[PDB]
């Protein structure tokens with residue numbers, strides 16, 4: 001009923017949308033992994049009379065439900081999608097997207113890691129993102145590679161028209177007391193990567209984590225703190 005939707009409020013297989021700003025929504029879904037249930041976020045950005053999707057809804061059936069929710073709530077076609085790293089909460093569902101006619105994109109690093117992992121593989125490579133601090137435009141957003149953090153390939157997304165920073169899994173929510181799934185993370189580089197984000201997007205008004213509740217710029221420093229404390 002208007003609050004940001006939480007893990008216990010979303011059955012696995014359902015998807016919710018949350019309006020962030022004019023023309024900007026997050027999508028929220030839940031999935032089971034290794035016997036626990038987690039929420040995860042993605043982004044939707046209006047692109048004229050089309051939509052740009054950032055990240056799948058973590059699985060094929062969730063992603064079909066995402067497309068149905070978008071049609072219900074927004075009614076514009078998703079024409080392109082970007083996955084912000086290689087894990088299943090970002091690329092699981094790419095096959096559903098592709099079969100629905102959505103053009104799917106990721107960095108070459110993400111595509112290689114997804115392939116090697118046995119995850120679904122976005123179709124098109126996003127060049128110009130291989131060095132930390134790189135940025136490229138993609139429709140109504142900027143894609144930024146901050147350096148290794150949650151994963152070596154993680155990208156962040158900025159919506160300049162709305163000052164919305166989507167951190168993906170490189171950014172944690174404020175209630176987080178752990179660094180999440182660190183299997184593929186670089187804990188030593190993560191704080192430096194966050195500092196690059198902070199320097200590059202000082203006017204961000206909303207920061208959206210990969211999992212959990214949006215907030216303001218404090219999520220960035222909070223993430224650096226949680227990661228340093230995990231590493232310690």
Ligand SMILES: CC(=O)Nc1nc2cccc(-c3c(C(=O)O)[nH]c4c(C(C)C)cccc34)c2s1
Nearest residue numbers: 033038087088089150169179180181182210211
């Ligand atoms: C023992 C343990 O794993 N605890 C965890 N707590 C959290 C809290 C928030 C997020 C996560 C979390 C993240 C993330 O951090 O991006 N990715 C996850 C994936 C992908 C690899 C598909 C699977 C399962 C979960 C996550 C976790 S994992």
Ligand SMILES: [Zn+2]
Nearest residue numbers: 085087150169
């Ligand atoms: Zn991940």
Ligand SMILES: [Zn+2]
Nearest residue numbers: 089169210211
């Ligand atoms: Zn994640």
